[PDB]
Amino acid sequence: VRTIKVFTTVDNINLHTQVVDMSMTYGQQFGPTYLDGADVTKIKPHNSHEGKTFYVLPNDDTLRVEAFEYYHTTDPSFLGRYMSALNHTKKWKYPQVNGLTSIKWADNNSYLATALLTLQQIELKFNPPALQDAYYRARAGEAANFCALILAYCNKTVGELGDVRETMSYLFQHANLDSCKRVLNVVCKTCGQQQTTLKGVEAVMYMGTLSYEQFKKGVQIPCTCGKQATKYLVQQESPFVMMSAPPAQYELKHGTFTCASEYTGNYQCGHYKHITSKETLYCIDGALLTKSSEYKGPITDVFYKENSYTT
């Protein structure tokens, strides 16, 4: 008999009018239900809920299409994981540090801070509307939805150990890198030379050396014949490149790179910091900021500006 009007949604844009019975839980009426990230499935409607928007899972064809068009995923657990993360990230603080949105440390989130800082320094356009909209808000300082989307797209929960390289790979999958192109040549003194072309995400990421100049000069890799061959960059067309390696002591020189991530710890436990090269070297550690003219530390990922390179 007693009812309120609420709206359900999967994208927080398209609303769906509902009349709910205040004697039944939201779960009994909608399935799993969330109010700005909080799980209200086991709760009965409150007077204050009238007119508010609730997220639900895509449980009919209209919602399935809305959810795919907004998020570009059909993983059945995506919206519940996004909501579970948002209930935490909405409580984080996002200070402006040296002109960039950072994240005050909470919930083991240092890998997310350095990823967020990196994104604001490289040219990248996302494809899912969810990421376009949330990234716009993040740049303005309201990064809770963007951070909870990063967790959901990477299948990481709040508090879980994350890797910056893997996180960036997920975000780049959902970005328009279609025009990026990389040409490599591999030279074996026994077998001869082989050229390879890479496209998209694989054209901007490399694992094995932090140094873009070393990649141009040549890096040693195994050949199937048993000798060590040399791999070198012949041609690059992209607005940035990302060079990654297992953490190692490495010296970062002012003016020779855009930004970098530093990892202190081991394979089970550690902490990330961000280094950015501007008028000097700034080290951003969540809300914390220090400066130096030189920098040495256990670097894992370095980003460089690019446009067009030909050997």
Chain residues binding Zn ion by CB under 5 A are 188, 190-191, 223, 225, 227
Rounded to a whole number, what is the largest CA-CA distance in the chain? 84
Q: Where does residue 154 fall: left (phi above 0), alpha (psi -120 to 50 degrees), or beta otherwise? A: alpha
Pairing of the two strands 259-266 and 269-277: antiparallel
Q: Is 79 in the site for Cl ion (CB under 5 A)?
A: no
Nearer to Zn ion by C-beta: 219 or 223?
Answer: 223
CB of 226 to Zn ion, least distance (A): 7
Q: Is 108 in the site for Cl ion (CB under 5 A)?
A: no
CB of 27 to Cl ion, least distance (A): 19
List the single partner that 225 binds among Zn ion, Cl ion, none, CB under 5 to 8 Å by kind: Zn ion
CB of 92 to Cl ion, least distance (A): 25
Q: Using the rule CB under 5 A, which residue among 4, 7, 14, 22 binds Cl ion?
A: 14
Residues 37-76 that bind Cl ion (CB under 5 A): 66
List the single partner that 5 binds among Cl ion, Zn ion, none, CB under 5 to 8 Å by kind: none
CB of 230 to Zn ion, least distance (A): 11
List the single partner that 10 binds among Cl ion, Zn ion, none, CB under 5 to 8 Å by kind: Cl ion
Q: How far is it, in rounded angstroms, from Cα 303 to Cα 80?
A: 33
Nearer to Zn ion by C-beta: 150 or 186?
Answer: 186
List the single partner that 48 binds among Cl ion, Zn ion, none, CB under 5 to 8 Å by kind: none
Q: Is 11 in the site for Cl ion (CB under 5 A)?
A: yes
CB of 193 to Zn ion, least distance (A): 10
CB of 192 to Zn ion, least distance (A): 8
Pairing of the two strands 259-266 and 38-39: unpaired
* Residues at the interface with Cl ion (CB under 5 A): 9-11, 14, 66
